[PDB]
PDB file of C-alpha atoms and ligand atoms in Angstrom:
ATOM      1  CA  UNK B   1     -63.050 -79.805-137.176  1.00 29.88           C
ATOM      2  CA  UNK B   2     -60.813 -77.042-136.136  1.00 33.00           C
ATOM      3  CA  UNK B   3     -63.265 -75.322-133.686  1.00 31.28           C
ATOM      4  CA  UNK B   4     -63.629 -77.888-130.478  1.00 32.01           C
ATOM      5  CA  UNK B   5     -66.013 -77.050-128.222  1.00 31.75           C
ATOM      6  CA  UNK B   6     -63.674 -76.592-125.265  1.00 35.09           C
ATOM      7  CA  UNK B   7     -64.948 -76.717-121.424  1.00 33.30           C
ATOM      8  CA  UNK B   8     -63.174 -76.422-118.196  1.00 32.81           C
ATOM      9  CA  UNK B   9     -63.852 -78.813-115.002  1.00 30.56           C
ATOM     10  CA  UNK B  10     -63.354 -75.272-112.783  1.00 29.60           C
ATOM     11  CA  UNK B  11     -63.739 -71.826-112.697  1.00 28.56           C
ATOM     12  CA  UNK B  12     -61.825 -69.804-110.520  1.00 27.37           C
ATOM     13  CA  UNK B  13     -62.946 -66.398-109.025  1.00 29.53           C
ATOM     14  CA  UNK B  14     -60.760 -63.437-108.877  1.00 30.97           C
ATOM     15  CA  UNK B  15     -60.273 -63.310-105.410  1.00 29.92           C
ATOM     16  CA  UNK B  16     -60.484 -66.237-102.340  1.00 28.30           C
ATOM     17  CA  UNK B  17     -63.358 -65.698-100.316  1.00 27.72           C
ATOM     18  CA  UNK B  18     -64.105 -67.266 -96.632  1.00 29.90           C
ATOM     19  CA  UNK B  19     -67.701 -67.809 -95.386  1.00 29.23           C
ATOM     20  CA  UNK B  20     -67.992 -66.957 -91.608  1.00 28.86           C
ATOM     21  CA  UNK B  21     -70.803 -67.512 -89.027  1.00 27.87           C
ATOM     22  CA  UNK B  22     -71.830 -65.953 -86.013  1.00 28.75           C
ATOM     23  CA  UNK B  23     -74.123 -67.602 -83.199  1.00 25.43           C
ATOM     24  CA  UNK B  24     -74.960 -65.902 -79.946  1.00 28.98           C
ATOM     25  CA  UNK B  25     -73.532 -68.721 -77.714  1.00 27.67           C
ATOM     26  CA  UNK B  26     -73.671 -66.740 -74.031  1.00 31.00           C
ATOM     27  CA  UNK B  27     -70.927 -69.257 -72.797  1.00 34.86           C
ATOM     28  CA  UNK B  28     -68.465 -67.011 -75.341  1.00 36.99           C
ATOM     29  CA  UNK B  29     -67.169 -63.773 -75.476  1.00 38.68           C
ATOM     30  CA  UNK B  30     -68.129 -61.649 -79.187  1.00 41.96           C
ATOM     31  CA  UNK B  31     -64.898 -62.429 -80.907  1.00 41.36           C
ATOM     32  CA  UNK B  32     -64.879 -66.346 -80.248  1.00 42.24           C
ATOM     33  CA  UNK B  33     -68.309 -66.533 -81.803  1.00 41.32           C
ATOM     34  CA  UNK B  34     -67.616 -65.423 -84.741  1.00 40.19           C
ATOM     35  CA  UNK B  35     -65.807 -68.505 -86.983  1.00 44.29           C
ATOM     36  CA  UNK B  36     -64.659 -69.655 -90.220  1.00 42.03           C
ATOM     37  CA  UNK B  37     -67.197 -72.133 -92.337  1.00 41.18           C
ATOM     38  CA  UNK B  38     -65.106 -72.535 -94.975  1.00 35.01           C
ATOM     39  CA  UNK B  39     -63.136 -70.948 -97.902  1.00 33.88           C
ATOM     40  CA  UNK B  40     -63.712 -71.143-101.716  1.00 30.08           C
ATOM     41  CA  UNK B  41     -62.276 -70.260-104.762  1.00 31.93           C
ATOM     42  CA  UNK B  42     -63.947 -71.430-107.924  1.00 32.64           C
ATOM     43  CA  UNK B  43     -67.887 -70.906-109.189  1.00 30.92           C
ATOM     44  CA  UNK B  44     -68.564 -74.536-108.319  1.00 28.06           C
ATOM     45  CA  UNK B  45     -67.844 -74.450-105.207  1.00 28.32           C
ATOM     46  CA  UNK B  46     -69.230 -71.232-104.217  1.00 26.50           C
ATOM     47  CA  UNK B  47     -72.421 -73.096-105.521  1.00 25.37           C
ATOM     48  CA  UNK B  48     -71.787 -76.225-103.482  1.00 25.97           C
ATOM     49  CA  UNK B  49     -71.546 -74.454-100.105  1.00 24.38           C
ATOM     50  CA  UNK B  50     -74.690 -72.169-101.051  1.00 25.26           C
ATOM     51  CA  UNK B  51     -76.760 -74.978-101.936  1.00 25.19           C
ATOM     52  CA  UNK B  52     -76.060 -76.970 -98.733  1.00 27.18           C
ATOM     53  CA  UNK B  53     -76.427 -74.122 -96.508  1.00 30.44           C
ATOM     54  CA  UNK B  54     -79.048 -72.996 -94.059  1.00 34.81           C
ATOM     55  CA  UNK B  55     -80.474 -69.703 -95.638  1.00 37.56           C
ATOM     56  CA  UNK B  56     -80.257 -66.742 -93.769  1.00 37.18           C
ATOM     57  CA  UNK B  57     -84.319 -66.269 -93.723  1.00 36.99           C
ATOM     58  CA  UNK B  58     -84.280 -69.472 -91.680  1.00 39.58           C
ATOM     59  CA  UNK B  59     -81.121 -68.533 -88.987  1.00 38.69           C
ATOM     60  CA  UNK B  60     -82.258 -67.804 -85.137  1.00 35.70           C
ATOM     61  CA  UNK B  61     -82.204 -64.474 -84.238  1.00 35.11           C
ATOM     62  CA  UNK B  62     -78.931 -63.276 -83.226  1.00 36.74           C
ATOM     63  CA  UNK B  63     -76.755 -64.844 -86.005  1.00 38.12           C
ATOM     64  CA  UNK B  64     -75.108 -63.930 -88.741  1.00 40.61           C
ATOM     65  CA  UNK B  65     -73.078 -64.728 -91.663  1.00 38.20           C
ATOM     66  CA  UNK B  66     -70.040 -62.617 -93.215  1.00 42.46           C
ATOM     67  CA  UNK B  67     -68.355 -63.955 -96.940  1.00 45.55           C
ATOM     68  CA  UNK B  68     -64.653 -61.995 -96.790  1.00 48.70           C
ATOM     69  CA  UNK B  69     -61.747 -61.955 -98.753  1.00 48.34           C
ATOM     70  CA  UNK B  70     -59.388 -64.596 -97.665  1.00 46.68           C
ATOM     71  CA  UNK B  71     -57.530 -63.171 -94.552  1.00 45.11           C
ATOM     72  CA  UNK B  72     -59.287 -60.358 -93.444  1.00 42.06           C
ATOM     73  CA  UNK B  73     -61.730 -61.394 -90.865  1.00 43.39           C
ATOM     74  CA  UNK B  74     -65.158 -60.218 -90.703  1.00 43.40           C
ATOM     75  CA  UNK B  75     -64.919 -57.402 -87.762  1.00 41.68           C
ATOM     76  CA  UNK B  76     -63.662 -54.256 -86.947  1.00 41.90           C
ATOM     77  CA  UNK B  77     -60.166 -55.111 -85.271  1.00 45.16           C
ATOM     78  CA  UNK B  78     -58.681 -56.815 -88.388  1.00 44.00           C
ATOM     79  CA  UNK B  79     -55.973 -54.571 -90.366  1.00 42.55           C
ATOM     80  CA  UNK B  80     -58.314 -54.464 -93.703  1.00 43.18           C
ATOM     81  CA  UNK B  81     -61.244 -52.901 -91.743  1.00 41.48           C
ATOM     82  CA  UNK B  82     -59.573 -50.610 -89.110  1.00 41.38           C
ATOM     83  CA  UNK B  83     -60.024 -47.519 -91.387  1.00 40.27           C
ATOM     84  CA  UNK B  84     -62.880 -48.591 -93.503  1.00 42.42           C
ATOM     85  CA  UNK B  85     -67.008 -48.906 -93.127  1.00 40.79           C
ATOM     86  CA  UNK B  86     -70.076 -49.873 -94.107  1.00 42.24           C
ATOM     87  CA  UNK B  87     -72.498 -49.358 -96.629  1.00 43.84           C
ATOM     88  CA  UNK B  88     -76.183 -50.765 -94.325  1.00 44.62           C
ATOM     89  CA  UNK B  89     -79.653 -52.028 -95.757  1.00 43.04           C
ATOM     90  CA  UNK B  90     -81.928 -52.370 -93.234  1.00 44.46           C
ATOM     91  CA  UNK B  91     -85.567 -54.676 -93.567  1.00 45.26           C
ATOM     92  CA  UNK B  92     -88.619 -54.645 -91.994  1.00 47.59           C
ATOM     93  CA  UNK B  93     -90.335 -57.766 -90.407  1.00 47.74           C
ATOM     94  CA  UNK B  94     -92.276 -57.826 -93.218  1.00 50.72           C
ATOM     95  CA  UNK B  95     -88.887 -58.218 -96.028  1.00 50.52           C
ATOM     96  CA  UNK B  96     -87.771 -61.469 -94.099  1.00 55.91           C
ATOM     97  CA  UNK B  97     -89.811 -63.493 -96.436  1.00 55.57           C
ATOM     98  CA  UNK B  98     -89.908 -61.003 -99.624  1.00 58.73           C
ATOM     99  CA  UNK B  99     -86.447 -59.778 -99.720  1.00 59.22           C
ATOM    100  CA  UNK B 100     -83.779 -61.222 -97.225  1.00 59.37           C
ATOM    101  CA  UNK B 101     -82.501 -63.979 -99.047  1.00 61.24           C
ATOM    102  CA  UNK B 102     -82.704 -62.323-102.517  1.00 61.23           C
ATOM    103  CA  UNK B 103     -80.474 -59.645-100.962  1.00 58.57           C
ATOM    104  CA  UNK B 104     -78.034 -61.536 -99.723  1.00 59.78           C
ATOM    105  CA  UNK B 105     -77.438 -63.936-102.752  1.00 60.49           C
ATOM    106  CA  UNK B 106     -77.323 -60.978-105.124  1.00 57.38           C
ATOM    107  CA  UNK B 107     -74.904 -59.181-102.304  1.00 56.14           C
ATOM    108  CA  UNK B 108     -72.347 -62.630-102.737  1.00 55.77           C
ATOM    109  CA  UNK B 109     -72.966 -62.453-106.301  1.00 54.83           C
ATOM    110  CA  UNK B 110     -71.729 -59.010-106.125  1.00 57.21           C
ATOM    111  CA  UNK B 111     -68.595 -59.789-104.407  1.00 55.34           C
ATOM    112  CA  UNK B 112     -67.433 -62.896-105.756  1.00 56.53           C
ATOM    113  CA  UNK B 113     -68.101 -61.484-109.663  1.00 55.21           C
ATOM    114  CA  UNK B 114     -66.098 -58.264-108.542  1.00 55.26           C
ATOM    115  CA  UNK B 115     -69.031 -56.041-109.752  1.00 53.78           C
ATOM    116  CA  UNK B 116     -67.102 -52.878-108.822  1.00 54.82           C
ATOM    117  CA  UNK B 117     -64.749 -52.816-111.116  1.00 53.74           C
ATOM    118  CA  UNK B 118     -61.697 -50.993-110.597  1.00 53.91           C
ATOM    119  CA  UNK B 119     -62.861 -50.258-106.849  1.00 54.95           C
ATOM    120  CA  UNK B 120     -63.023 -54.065-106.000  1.00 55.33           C
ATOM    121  CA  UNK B 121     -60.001 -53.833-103.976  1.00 54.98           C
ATOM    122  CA  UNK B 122     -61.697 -51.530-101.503  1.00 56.87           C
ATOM    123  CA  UNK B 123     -63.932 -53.935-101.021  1.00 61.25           C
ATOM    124  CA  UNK B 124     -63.436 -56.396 -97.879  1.00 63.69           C
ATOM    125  CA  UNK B 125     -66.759 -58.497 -97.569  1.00 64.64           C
ATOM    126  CA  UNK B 126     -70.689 -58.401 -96.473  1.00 66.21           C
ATOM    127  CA  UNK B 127     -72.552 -59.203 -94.006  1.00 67.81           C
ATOM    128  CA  UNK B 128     -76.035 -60.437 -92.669  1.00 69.68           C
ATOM    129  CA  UNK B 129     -77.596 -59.647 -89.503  1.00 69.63           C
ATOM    130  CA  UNK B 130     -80.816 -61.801 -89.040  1.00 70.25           C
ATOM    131  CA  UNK B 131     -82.968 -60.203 -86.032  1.00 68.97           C
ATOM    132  CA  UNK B 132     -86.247 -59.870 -84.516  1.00 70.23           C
ATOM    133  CA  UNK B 133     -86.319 -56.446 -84.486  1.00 70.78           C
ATOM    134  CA  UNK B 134     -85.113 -56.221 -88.633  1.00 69.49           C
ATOM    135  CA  UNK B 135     -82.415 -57.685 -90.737  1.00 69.83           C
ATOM    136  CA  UNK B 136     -79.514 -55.771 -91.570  1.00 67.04           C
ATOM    137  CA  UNK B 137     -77.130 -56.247 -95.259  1.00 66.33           C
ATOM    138  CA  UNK B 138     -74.094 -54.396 -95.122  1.00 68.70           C
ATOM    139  CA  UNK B 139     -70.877 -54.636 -97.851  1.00 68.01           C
ATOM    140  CA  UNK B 140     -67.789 -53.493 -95.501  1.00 68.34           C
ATOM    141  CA  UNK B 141     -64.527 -51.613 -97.331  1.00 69.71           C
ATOM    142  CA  UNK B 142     -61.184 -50.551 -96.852  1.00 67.73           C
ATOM    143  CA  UNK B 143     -61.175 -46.857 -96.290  1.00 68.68           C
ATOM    144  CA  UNK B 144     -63.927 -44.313 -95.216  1.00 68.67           C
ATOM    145  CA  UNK B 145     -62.099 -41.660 -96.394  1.00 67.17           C
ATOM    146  CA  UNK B 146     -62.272 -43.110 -99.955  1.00 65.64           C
ATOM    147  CA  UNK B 147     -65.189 -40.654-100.908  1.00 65.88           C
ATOM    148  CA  UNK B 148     -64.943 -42.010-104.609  1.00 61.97           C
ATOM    149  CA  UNK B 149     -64.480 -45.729-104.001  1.00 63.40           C
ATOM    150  CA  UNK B 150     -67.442 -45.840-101.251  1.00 59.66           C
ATOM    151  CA  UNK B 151     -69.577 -43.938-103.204  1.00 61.08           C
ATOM    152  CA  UNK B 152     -69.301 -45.977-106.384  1.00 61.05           C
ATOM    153  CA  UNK B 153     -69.307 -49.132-104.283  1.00 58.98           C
ATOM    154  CA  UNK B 154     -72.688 -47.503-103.018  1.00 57.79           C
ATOM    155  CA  UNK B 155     -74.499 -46.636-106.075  1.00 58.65           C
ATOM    156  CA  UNK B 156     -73.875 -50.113-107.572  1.00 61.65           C
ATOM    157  CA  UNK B 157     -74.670 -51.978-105.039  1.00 62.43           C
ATOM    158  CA  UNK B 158     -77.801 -49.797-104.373  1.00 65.75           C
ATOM    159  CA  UNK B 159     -78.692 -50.336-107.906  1.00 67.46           C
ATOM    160  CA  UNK B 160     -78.189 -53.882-107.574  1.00 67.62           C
ATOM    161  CA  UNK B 161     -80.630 -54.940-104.921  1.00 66.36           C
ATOM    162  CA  UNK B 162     -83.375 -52.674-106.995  1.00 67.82           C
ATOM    163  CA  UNK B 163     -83.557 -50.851-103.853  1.00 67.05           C
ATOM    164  CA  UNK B 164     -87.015 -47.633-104.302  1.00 67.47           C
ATOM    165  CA  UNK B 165     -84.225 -44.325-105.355  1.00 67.89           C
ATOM    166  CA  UNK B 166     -85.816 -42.309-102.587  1.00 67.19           C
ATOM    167  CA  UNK B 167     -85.012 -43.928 -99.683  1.00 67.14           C
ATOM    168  CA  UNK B 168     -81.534 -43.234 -98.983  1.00 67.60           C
ATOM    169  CA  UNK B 169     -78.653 -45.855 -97.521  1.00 66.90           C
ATOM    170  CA  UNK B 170     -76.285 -44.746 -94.973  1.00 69.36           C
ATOM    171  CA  UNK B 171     -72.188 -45.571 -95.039  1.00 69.89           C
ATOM    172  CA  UNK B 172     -71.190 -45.687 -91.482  1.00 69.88           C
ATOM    173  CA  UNK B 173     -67.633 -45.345 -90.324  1.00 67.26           C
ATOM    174  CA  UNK B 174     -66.524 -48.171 -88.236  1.00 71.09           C
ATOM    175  CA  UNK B 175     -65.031 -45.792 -85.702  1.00 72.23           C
ATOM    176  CA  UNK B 176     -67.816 -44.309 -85.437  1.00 71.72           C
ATOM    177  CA  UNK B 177     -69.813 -47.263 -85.197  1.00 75.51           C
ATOM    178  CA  UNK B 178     -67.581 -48.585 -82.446  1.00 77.13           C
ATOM    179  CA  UNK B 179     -67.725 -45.493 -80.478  1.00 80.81           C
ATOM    180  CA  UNK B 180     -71.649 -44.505 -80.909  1.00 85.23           C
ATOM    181  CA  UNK B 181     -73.710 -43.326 -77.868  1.00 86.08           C
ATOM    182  CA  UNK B 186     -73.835 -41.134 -87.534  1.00 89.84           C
ATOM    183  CA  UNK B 187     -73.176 -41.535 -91.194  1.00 87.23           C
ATOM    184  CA  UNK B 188     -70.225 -39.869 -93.500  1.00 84.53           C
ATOM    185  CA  UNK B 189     -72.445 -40.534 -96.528  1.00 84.09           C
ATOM    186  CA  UNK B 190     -76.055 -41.558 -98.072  1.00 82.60           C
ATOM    187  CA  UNK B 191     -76.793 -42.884-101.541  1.00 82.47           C
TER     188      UNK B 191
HETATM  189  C1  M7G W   1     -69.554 -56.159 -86.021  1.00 83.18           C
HETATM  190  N1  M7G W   1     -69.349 -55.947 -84.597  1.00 83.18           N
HETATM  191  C2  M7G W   1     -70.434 -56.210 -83.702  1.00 83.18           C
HETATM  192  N2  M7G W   1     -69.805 -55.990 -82.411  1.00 83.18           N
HETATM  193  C3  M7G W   1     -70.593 -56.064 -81.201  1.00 83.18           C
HETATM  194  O1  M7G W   1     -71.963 -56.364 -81.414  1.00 83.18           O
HETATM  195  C4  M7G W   1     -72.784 -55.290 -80.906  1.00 83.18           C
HETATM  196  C5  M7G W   1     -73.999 -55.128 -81.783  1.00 83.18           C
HETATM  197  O2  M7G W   1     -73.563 -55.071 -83.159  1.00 83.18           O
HETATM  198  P1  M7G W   1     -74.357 -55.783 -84.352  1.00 83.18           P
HETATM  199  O3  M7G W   1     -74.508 -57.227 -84.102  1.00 83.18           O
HETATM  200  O4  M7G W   1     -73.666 -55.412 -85.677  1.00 83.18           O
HETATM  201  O5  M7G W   1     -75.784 -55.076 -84.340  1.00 83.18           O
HETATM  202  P2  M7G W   1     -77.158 -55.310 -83.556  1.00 83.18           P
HETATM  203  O6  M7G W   1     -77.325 -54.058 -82.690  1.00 83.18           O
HETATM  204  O7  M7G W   1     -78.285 -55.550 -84.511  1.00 83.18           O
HETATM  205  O8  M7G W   1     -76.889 -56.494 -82.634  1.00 83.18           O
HETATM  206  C6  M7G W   1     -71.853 -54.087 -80.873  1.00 83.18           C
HETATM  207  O9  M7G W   1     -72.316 -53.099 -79.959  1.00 83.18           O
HETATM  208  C7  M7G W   1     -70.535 -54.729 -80.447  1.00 83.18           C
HETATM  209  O10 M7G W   1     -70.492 -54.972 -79.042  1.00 83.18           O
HETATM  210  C8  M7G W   1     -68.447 -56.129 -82.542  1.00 83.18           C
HETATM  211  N3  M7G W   1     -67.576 -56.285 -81.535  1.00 83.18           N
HETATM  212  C9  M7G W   1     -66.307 -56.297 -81.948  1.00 83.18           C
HETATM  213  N4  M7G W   1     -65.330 -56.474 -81.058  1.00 83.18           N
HETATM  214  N5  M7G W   1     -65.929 -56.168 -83.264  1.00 83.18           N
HETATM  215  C10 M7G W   1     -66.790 -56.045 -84.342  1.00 83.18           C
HETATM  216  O11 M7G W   1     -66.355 -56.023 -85.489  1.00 83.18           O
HETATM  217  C11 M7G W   1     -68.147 -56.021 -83.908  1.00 83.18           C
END
C-alpha cells in the first residue's frame, strides 16, 4: 500500500550525444561529408535510432559513423579534439561478420553509460571506419597529454570489447595523425 511500484516514461543519459555519418560522395570536399543524423538524450531513444539504423557491417566501404557529445563535431578541427587523440582497434576481413557490430554497440554503450567514471569528461566520442582493406573502432578524447585519463579510458575500454591481453592498442595523437608521412601510448 505504501510501496507503489513507480516507473518513468524516460530516461535521460548523462550527457547529449549526436550520431554523425560519413559517405564518400566525390562531388564533396572531406568536411561537407561528414553530417549530423540526429541527436538523443534519453535510453529510449538511443534505442529507437539504433534499431532503425543501417548497421555498420552492412555500410559501403568508405563510410563511417561517429556518436559525439553534443557540440563537438566528430573531426580534428573542432575545439574539443584539437589537443586530444585516439585510442584505435583495428579488424581483419575476417572480424566484419564476427566482431564489427558487437564492437561498436558495446563502444556506444560505453559512451552513453559514461563507463569511465570520473574520466568521462575527457571523453569526446567514437568512431567507425568500415573498409575493404579492415575496419577501424576508435573512442577520441580531449587531451593527449592526459597520460592518466587516456590510459584509464584505454584499459576499460580494452577490457570492454574482450579484446586477447597480448595484442596491444595504440593511442594516436591527432597531430600526429594529421601530420603523418606514431603512437604516444599502447595498452
Ligand atoms: C578523421 N579525419 C579523416 N581525415 C581525412 O581522411 C583521410 C583518411 O583518414 P581516415 O578515413 O580516418 O582513414 P583511412 O585511411 O582508413 O581512410 C585523412 O588522410 C584525411 O585527409 C580528416 N580530414 C580532416 N580535415 N579532419 C579530420 O578530422 C579527418
Amino acid at each position: 500500500m505504501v510501496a507503489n511500484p513507480e516507473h518513468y516514461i524516460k530516461h535521460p543519459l548523462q550527457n547529449r550525444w549526436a550520431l554523425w555519418f560519413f559517405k564518400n560522395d566525390k562531388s564533396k570536399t572531406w568536411q561537407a561529408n561528414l553530417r549530423l543524423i540526429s541527436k538523443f538524450d534519453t535510453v529510449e531513444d538511443f534505442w529507437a535510432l539504433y534499431n532503425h539504423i543501417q548497421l555498420s557491417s552492412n555500410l559501403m566501404p568508405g563510410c563511417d559513423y561517429s556518436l559525439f557529445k553534443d557540440g563537438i563535431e566528430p573531426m580534428w578541427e573542432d575545439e574539443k579534439n584539437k589537443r586530444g587523440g585516439r585510442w584505435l582497434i583495428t579488424l581483419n576481413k575476417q572480424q566484419r561478420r564476427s566482431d564489427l557490430d558487437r564492437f561498436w554497440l558495446e563502444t556506444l554503450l560505453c559512451l552513453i553509460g559514461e563507463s569511465f567514471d570520473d574520466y568521462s569528461d575527457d571523453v569526446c566520442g567514437a568512431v567507425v571506419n568500415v573498409r575493404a582493406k579492415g575496419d577501424k573502432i576508435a573512442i577520441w578524447t580531449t587531451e593527449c597529454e592526459n597520460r592518466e585519463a587516456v590510459t584509464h579510458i584505454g584499459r576499460v575500454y580494452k577490457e570492454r570489447l574482450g579484446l586477447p591481453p597480448k595484442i596491444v592498442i595504440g593511442y594516436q595523437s591527432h597531430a600526429d595523425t594529421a601530420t603523418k608521412s606514431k603512437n604516444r601510448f599502447v595498452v
